[PDB]
Amino acid sequence: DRATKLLTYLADVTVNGHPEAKDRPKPLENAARPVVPYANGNGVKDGTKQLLDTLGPKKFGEWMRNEKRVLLTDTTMRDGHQSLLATRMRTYDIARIAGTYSHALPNLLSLECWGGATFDVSMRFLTEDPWERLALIREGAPNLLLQMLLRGANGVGYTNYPDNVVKYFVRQAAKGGIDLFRVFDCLNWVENMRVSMDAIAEENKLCEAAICYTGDILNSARPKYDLKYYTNLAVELEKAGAHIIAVKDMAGLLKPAAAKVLFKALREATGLPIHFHTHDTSGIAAATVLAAVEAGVDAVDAAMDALSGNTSQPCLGSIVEALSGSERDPGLDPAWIRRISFYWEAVRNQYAAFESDLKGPASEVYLHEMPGGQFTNLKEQARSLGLETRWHQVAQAYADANQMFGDIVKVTPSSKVVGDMALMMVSQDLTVADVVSPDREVSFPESVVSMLKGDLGQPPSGWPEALQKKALKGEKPYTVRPGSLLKEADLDAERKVIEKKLEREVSDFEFASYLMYPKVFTDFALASDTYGPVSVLPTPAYFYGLADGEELFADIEKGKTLVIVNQAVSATDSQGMVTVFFELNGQPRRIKVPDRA
Amino acid sequence: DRATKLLTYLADVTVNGHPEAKDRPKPLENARPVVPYANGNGVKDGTKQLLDTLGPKKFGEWMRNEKRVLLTDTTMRDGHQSLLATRMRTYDIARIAGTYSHALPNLLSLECWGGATFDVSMRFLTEDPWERLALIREGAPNLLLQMLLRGANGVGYTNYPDNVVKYFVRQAAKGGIDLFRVFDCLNWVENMRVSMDAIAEENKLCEAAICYTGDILNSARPKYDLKYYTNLAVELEKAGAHIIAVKDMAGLLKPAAAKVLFKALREATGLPIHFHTHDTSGIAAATVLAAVEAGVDAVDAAMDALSGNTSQPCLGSIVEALSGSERDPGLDPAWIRRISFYWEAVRNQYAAFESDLKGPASEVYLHEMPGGQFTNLKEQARSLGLETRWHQVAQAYADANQMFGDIVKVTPSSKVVGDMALMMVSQDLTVADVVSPDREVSFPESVVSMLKGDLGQPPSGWPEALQKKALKGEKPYTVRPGSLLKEADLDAERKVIEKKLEREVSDFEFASYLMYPKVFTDFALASDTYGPVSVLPTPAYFYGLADGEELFADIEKGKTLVIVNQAVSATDSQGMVTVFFELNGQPRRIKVPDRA
Amino acid sequence: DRATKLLTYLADVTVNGHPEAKDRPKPLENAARPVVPYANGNGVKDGTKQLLDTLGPKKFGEWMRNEKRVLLTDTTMRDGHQSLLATRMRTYDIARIAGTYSHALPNLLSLECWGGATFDVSMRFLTEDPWERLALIREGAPNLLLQMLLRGANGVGYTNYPDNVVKYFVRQAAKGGIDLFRVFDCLNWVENMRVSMDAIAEENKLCEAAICYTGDILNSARPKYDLKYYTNLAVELEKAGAHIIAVKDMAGLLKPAAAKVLFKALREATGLPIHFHTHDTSGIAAATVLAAVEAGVDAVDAAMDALSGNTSQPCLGSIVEALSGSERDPGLDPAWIRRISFYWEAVRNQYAAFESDLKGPASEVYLHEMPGGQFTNLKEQARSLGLETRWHQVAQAYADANQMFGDIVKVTPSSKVVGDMALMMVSQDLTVADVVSPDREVSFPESVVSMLKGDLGQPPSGWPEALQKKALKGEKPYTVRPGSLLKEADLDAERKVIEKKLEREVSDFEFASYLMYPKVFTDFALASDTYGPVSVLPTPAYFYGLADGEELFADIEKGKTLVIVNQAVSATDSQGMVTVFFELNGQPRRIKVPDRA
Ligand SMILES: O=C([O-])C(=O)[O-]
Ligand SMILES: O=C([O-])C(=O)[O-]
Ligand SMILES: O=C([O-])C(=O)[O-]
Ligand SMILES: [Cl-]
Ligand SMILES: [Cl-]
Ligand SMILES: [Cl-]
Ligand SMILES: [Mg+2]
Ligand SMILES: [Mg+2]
Ligand SMILES: [Mg+2]
Ligand SMILES: [Zn+2]
Ligand SMILES: [Zn+2]
Ligand SMILES: [Zn+2]
Structure with missing residues (x-):
C-alpha cells in the first residue's frame, strides 16, 4: 500500500510532469547514474563527533584553538x-x-x-x-x-x-x-x-x-x-x-x-x-x-x-x-x-x-553586497517582474537601498527586505530621494513596513527617523526585542489544532515543523499521506517519472527493494483520467490519475 | 486461446494497419450498421421449398408460367x-x-x-x-x-x-x-x-x-x-x-x-x-x-x-x-x-x-469493358503511370478487340484484352505495329495462353497472323482444353495439401486447394495464427481498436467476448510492441512485432 | 490598374485562401487542365436560333410539334x-x-x-x-x-x-x-x-x-x-x-x-x-x-x-x-x-x-420527393445542425411535412419551406400531431408562417385551417395573388439609390440585378471594384491562387495576355500585411494584402 502510493506519485508525474521541473531545461539524455565510491575499509575512525562526546563543548572549542x-x-x-x-x-x-x-x-x-x-x-x-x-x-x-x-x-x-x-x-x-x-x-x-x-x-x-x-x-x-x-x-x-x-x-x-x-x-x-x-x-x-x-x-x-x-x-x-x-x-x-x-x-x-545563467566572477559584488545565497534568487525574481534587461540598475538599486536603511547588515532575512525594496525602486522608477520624499506616494512591501516596525530587530544606530515615519504611516515603532513583545505560545494548545487538522498525533519533530512553517508542514503532510515516502525515489524519477519500458529499482524499506517497470500509458479517458500500466515485482498494476493539463 | 489468437490479430493490425487499407482513405470517424428490427414471425416458404418440391426442370417451367x-x-x-x-x-x-x-x-x-x-x-x-x-x-x-x-x-x-x-x-x-x-x-x-x-x-x-x-x-x-x-x-x-x-x-x-x-x-x-x-x-x-x-x-x-x-x-x-x-x-x-x-x-x-467514378458514361458503347472490370483496370493503369491517358487505353481496348477477331469480353477474356490494351499504350503500339512482322514485341503470359487455345475458341477461330506471331514456335490447338488436361489424381493432390498443413482437411477445404493451391495454403496458415477473424466487425478487421475502445465479438454463438484496447506500449528493445487488453473483465497483454 | 486589381485578388487568395474552398477537399495535384476540343473547321450551321427569328415564337412552337x-x-x-x-x-x-x-x-x-x-x-x-x-x-x-x-x-x-x-x-x-x-x-x-x-x-x-x-x-x-x-x-x-x-x-x-x-x-x-x-x-x-x-x-x-x-x-x-x-x-x-x-x-x-458524397440512385426519392437541386443542400443543412446521423428521419419528416401541408408541389421556393419544416421537426423531435397540438408551443420557421400567410400563393385546395391558424399567431392570411398587394417599385428612385451607393451610373442589366438581389449585387459591385475582372482567371487560380514559382497566363482582353509569376511571398509584417512579390510580363510588382488568420 505504501507502494500503491509511490506508484500513484510516479504515475502522476510521468503523465503531468513535476511543476518545478516541467518549465525548465532537462539533463543530458545519456547521463551516468552517479556512482557512490567503494570505501576502502571496514570500520570508521573515531573523529570530531566522539571528541565532542568526550570533551563537551567548551573543552571542544579549546581543542580546536590549540x-x-x-x-x-x-x-x-x-x-x-x-x-x-x-x-x-x-x-x-x-x-x-x-x-x-x-x-x-x-x-x-x-x-x-x-x-x-x-x-x-x-x-x-x-x-x-x-x-x-x-x-x-x-x-x-x-x-x-x-x-x-x-x-x-x-x-x-x-x-x-x-x-x-x-x-x-x-x-x-x-x-x-x-x-x-x-x-x-x-x-x-x-x-x-x-x-x-x-x-x-x-x-x-x-x-x-x-x-x-x-x-x-x-x-x-x-x-x-x-x-x-x-x-x-x-x-x-x-x-x-x-x-x-x-x-x-x-x-x-x-x-x-x-x-x-x-x-x-x-x-x-x-x-x-x-x-x-x-x-x-x-x-x-x-x-x-x-x-x-x-x-x-x-x-x-x-x-x-x-x-x-x-x-x-x-x-x-x-x-x-x-x-x-x-x-x-x-x-x-x-x-x-x-x-x-x-x-x-x-x-x-x-x-x-x-542551474543559473551565471558565467563567472564579478567584482560588481563589492558595489551591491548581495549574499551568495541571494543573487540568483533575486535575478530570477527580477526576471519575474520583467526586469532581466535592467539588471545592473537593479544592482545599483540594491546598493542605494542599503545606504537608505542606514548602511545595514544584509543577510537572511534582512537581505530579502532590501531585495524587495530594490525591485520596487527600479519598477516604479523611484530614486532614494523620491523614496524618502514627503509629496511622493509610495506603497512599501509587507516586509519593509515589518522591519522598520522592529521585527528583524535593531541595528547599532537604530533606523532612520524619516524613512520609517513615512513607511509606518501611523503604526507606532518599537525598539525592544521582538521576542519580548510576542506572547509565549501555548504549546499544548497549538498541538491540538495541528493534530486535529491531521486527525492523528504528530511526532515532537513534526510539531516543530508546524511551529516553524504551519501551512507548509500541513501541505507536506497531506502530500505525505497521498504520495507516501516520495524521498526514496532516485532523482530522475522524482522529477520526470519513468520513461516507456524503463525499469526502476527503489527501496521503500530497509532491505526491501521494489522492481517497478512502466510498460505502457493510456490515452485520456471519458472521465479525464489517465491509466499508467505498471509491472511491480513481476505483478501487473493499473494506476489512474488526472490529466491536470 | 481461440480468443488469444484474435487478440493477436487486433494487436498486429492496430499497430501495423491492414496492408489492403493502410494507405487509402478512411471512413468518417463518425454510425455502425443496425440489423433492422425482427418482425416476430417465422419465415414464409419461398423458391427454395418450391425447388425442393418440383426439381429443376419443373421449377424452370414454373418461372416461365x-x-x-x-x-x-x-x-x-x-x-x-x-x-x-x-x-x-x-x-x-x-x-x-x-x-x-x-x-x-x-x-x-x-x-x-x-x-x-x-x-x-x-x-x-x-x-x-x-x-x-x-x-x-x-x-x-x-x-x-x-x-x-x-x-x-x-x-x-x-x-x-x-x-x-x-x-x-x-x-x-x-x-x-x-x-x-x-x-x-x-x-x-x-x-x-x-x-x-x-x-x-x-x-x-x-x-x-x-x-x-x-x-x-x-x-x-x-x-x-x-x-x-x-x-x-x-x-x-x-x-x-x-x-x-x-x-x-x-x-x-x-x-x-x-x-x-x-x-x-x-x-x-x-x-x-x-x-x-x-x-x-x-x-x-x-x-x-x-x-x-x-x-x-x-x-x-x-x-x-x-x-x-x-x-x-x-x-x-x-x-x-x-x-x-x-x-x-x-x-x-x-x-x-x-x-x-x-x-x-x-x-x-x-x-x-471506392473508385473515383463520377457517374454514367456512354463511352461504354465504344470500349465494352465489363462493369466488374472498369475500376480494376483504371487501378492497374494508375499502377502503370497512365492515369493521364485513360481514354487512349479505352481506345486500345476497342482496337484490341477488333484485332482478336471481335470477341466476347467477360471473365477471364476481359483480363486478356486488358493486358494487351495496357501494353499497347505503354509500348506505343498501333494494331498495325502489333501484328507487324518487323516490330518485335513480348506478349503477356495471359495473351500467349489465350491464343494457344487455353480459354477456348471463338467462332471463326483466332486470326492466323496474330496467332503464329505470338506463338513464336508453339503449335496451337483447337480442341476443348480439358479434353487434353490430365485427369488430376485427386487422392494424390489431397495428400500434398495434408502433409503441408499437418492435418486432415474437409472436402470443401480440398475444393479451395484445387482451385487455388497457393492461395488456400496462405489462408490456412493465417487462420491457425489469427483465428476466426471473420467474426470481427468490419472497422476492427481493417483498423483494429482505438484507445479505450470497447468491442463485442461472438466467438461461438451464445458466447460473446468483450474486448477492450486499454493501452499500447512504445516499442521495446527487442523490436516488439505490447497491446494491453481486457477480455471479459480480465487483463491480457499481447506482444506484436513492429514492421515499420 | 485592372492588372493591379487582379494581382491583388491573386495575392489575397494565395495568402489567405478562398473562403469557399480552403476547408474542403482539393483537386488532384497532377490535374490535367481542360482542353477545348479541336474543331474540324466546318462553318456553323443555322439552327433553332435562325428558325425562331424567322417564324416568331408561335410558329416555332408549331415547328417543334410537327x-x-x-x-x-x-x-x-x-x-x-x-x-x-x-x-x-x-x-x-x-x-x-x-x-x-x-x-x-x-x-x-x-x-x-x-x-x-x-x-x-x-x-x-x-x-x-x-x-x-x-x-x-x-x-x-x-x-x-x-x-x-x-x-x-x-x-x-x-x-x-x-x-x-x-x-x-x-x-x-x-x-x-x-x-x-x-x-x-x-x-x-x-x-x-x-x-x-x-x-x-x-x-x-x-x-x-x-x-x-x-x-x-x-x-x-x-x-x-x-x-x-x-x-x-x-x-x-x-x-x-x-x-x-x-x-x-x-x-x-x-x-x-x-x-x-x-x-x-x-x-x-x-x-x-x-x-x-x-x-x-x-x-x-x-x-x-x-x-x-x-x-x-x-x-x-x-x-x-x-x-x-x-x-x-x-x-x-x-x-x-x-x-x-x-x-x-x-x-x-x-x-x-x-x-x-x-x-x-x-x-x-x-x-x-x-462534390457531395452521394453514392448513387435512391428509391427513397419516391418517399421524400425532394427536388434534385435541393437534395444535397438540404443534406448539408442537416449536417450543419448536428443531424447527419439522422438524415433518414429528415427525409421521413419531409414527407410527413408535405402531407401536413395538404400534399403540395415542392419546388423553388416552396421546397425550402417544407425543408425548414422537416429540420425543425427532427431537431426538436416533433411529430405532425405535436406540431398542430393545442398544448404545445411551436415557433414555426419564417418561411412556413409566410407560406401559410399566402406569400408564395395558393395551392388548389387552400391551406389547412388549423395548422395555418396556429402558425400565424393572430395574423390574417390572404388568398389573392401576392403581387397584387405589393407596392409598384418606384423604378426611377431605386435606380438613384444604387447609383448614389456606388457613385456611378449603372446599366439596365446591373439595375435588374439590383432589383432582384440588392444586397448581393451591391457586394458584388464593390468586390469588382477592388478585385477587377476576376472572371477571366482560370478556375484553379480563382480558388487557390499561385503556388511558389508558378507561371500563370491571363487575358484581361483579347490582344493582351498577362504572364504572372509568384516569385516569393513575405512573412507577415508588423502591420499584419503580407507582401506577395510578382513578376508581370517580366516586370516586378509587389502587392500587399492582409493576413486574415
Ligand atoms: O545561508 C543563509 O543565509 C540562509 O539560508 O539562512
Ligand atoms: O463477375 C464476373 O464477371 C466474374 O467474376 O466472372
Ligand atoms: O431549379 C430550381 O429549382 C431553381 O433554381 O429554381
Ligand atoms: Cl506553512
Ligand atoms: Cl493459390
Ligand atoms: Cl440581396
Ligand atoms: Mg587552531
Ligand atoms: Mg414468367
Ligand atoms: Mg414533334
Ligand atoms: Zn553562505
Ligand atoms: Zn455482372
Ligand atoms: Zn431541374
Missing part, C-alpha cells in the same frame, strides 16, 4: 546547493554519500548539511522530510560533527518567533542529530542572540556564534564597520557564552589583506576558536581563506569542487591542495576529495533545471 | 464486386440474410457466391468462402442461393481438368448452392457441357448463360446478330439447361434491343429466361423495364446503396416502376429501403475501396 | 452543376465550350445555361456577372436557342416580387440573349404565372409554361394529382398564351408507365409542343425519358455524361445512343457528345471542393 592543522567544514550538502541550485538537492543524493565521507575523510571538522533554506525547501518543493534527511546523515556519518545554520531568532524561517519556540526548536534540532549550531542574527545584534545561544548550551551542544561581515575594514572612508566593531562583538559573544566564533562573510566581501588583519585581532580579542565562512562571487575568496589560515584561523568552510565557485563557497580540493605540505596542512586525502567531487558532479547534472 | 417478373438481388456478389473490388465481408453479409428471409420472401434468389468472391475472401479478407455460404444458407433457408460459375474456369482464371470441375460443382451443391448461373467467356457451348452436366447430376438449377456483346440492331456489325443469340439458346436447351440467361456483363443491351431480343428468345425456346446487366451507361433500368414488357421471366438488380454505374441498376426503383402493373413483383418497398439503408451504413465502412 | 425527331435540350451549363456542384461552375469553363456546342451539335434545341440558382451564386460565391456570362455564351453559340429557368413571380429570387419588377427583369433577359424562357410557379398556380407569361410574349420570346409534377398519376390512392390535373392545367396554360408546354419533374418522380399515359394525354389535350425535364435521382429517369420519347414528346432535357446521373439530369450520350437509328433519332453525333463530355469531366475535376 589544534595546529586548519580544520575543515564541507558545505556541499547545504550552502553549496543553496547557492547554485536553489536548495533543490534531495535527501536521496545527500544521504547516499554520507558514509563515503565517513570512511574517506574522518579528519573533517563538520558536515554543513542542515538548516538554512533546506528546512523550508525540502518540504515545500521536494516533498520530503528534513528530519528524516538529518537522521540518514547521522546514521551514515557517526564519526563527524553535523552542522546547521540557525537564523538566531528567525529560526529556520523569515520572521522572529516567540522565545519558547526558538527554545523548543533548538531542543529538537539537538535530539535530531545536530552537533554544531552556527547561529547568527541578521543585524549582528547580540541582545537578540541570547535566547538562542543559551538554548544551545543548555542542550550541551556547540554554540558557534556568528558575526556577519559587511563593508571594508581597510577603507577609512567607510568607518562604521571598522576593526573595533568586530573585535567588540567577538568579546560580546564570548561574554554571552559562545563555544566558537564565526565570521559569516555571506556576500564574499572580505579581501585577503583584510583577513590578515581581522583574524589576527580576533584571536587577540578572544581565546575562543575562530571559524571563517565566505562565498566566492568575487573569484578571489580562496585567497581570503588562505590569508585567514596564515593569520591563524582555526576553521574554514569550502564546497566540493563540483559545486564550488561563483556564488558558492570556494573550491575545497584546491584549498587543501594549496595547504598540502604546510605547517597547517589539514591532513585530507586529495584523491578522495576528488572521488567525492566526481560523484557530486554526476549528482549535479541531474539538477539542470535549477 | 409466372406472370410476375421474378427478381434476383445481387448486392451480395456482383454489386460489391463491381463497386468495391469484391471486398465485402462475411460479417456484414451474413448478418442481414435473416432480414431478407423474413422481409423479402418473394425473391427468386440471392446472388451471393462465386465470381470473384471465392478468391478474394481468403486472399484479401482472411475468411473462408464456404463458411460465408453456410451462414447465408442458415439465415435464408427459404430463398435460392445463386452462384456465378465461370464454366470450365470454375472460380478461377484458367480452364481446369474435367474431374476438378466435376469435384468443385459437387461441393458447391453440398455447400448450399441451388442455382448455378454458368457461362463461358467465348459463348462456347462445347466448353459448357461438363459444367451443365455436373449441375444436373447434383439436381440443382443449371441457368446456362449467353454473354451479350455488340448491338443486334446495328446491321454494320452482323456477327453478333439475333440468330447468333437465338441459335445459342436452342443449343443450350438441348445441352439440358433449366433456364437461359442473358449475361450483359458490360451493359451494352439497349431498350429497343431488349424488346426485340427477349420476344425472339422466348419464341426459340420454351425455357424461362433471366436477364443480368450493369448500369455503366446510366440507362440499364430502361433495358430492364423493356425486357419485362417483353415477358422476360427474371431480372437481376442490386440494392439502391450498391447500385448504379458499374453495378446492376437500382432494385428499389425498378420495383417501384412495376408497382401496380400486371407484372408487379410483390416486394415491399419499405423493406427494400430499410435493407438499402443498411447496405449504405455497411458501405461507408469500405471507404478504402 | 418535327418527327425528338429535340434535345443540354442542361450541363445550368441544372447539371446546380444539382451536382452547388452551382459553382464558372463562366470561364462554361463560355469556353459554347463554340464547340455550336459547331458540333447544331441540331440541339437549346442550351439550358441561365437562371435558376446561377444568377445568385455567380455574384455571391463566384464574384462574377451573370449578364457577362450570358453574353459570352450568346457570342459563342449564335445558332442555338439559349434557355433560362424563370421562377414565375419569384423571378430569379426566393419570393414573389412586384409585377413591374418581374416585367423589368424579363425585358432585360430577352435583351441579354435569352430565347427560351421555362417559367413555373411553385404551386402550379396559373393565376400567379400570367404576368411572367405575358411579359415573355411581349418581348417576342418563347414562353415554355411548366406544369410541375408530383405524386403518381397511376396510383388511385393519391387522387389529388391525377391525369386530369395535368391535362386541365395544360389547357389553361395554352389559354394563357404558352408557346410550349413543359413538364417539370423537379424531383424525378415520373415513372416510365406514367409517362406513356401522360404524354399521349397531353398531346391530345393541346396542340402545343411538349417539353419534358426530370432528374435521375431514382436511377431510372433514362427509362422514363425514352418512354416519353416513344409516346411522342417533342423535347426532353439531358446532361452531358460527366455531369449526369443521380440528382442531375440523366445521361445524354446514352439516351442518344439508345435513340440511334430509331424513327425519332435526334441526329446528334455521339462522338462529338463524348468529346464534349470529356472536356466537362476535366472541367469538373477542378471543382472537387464542391
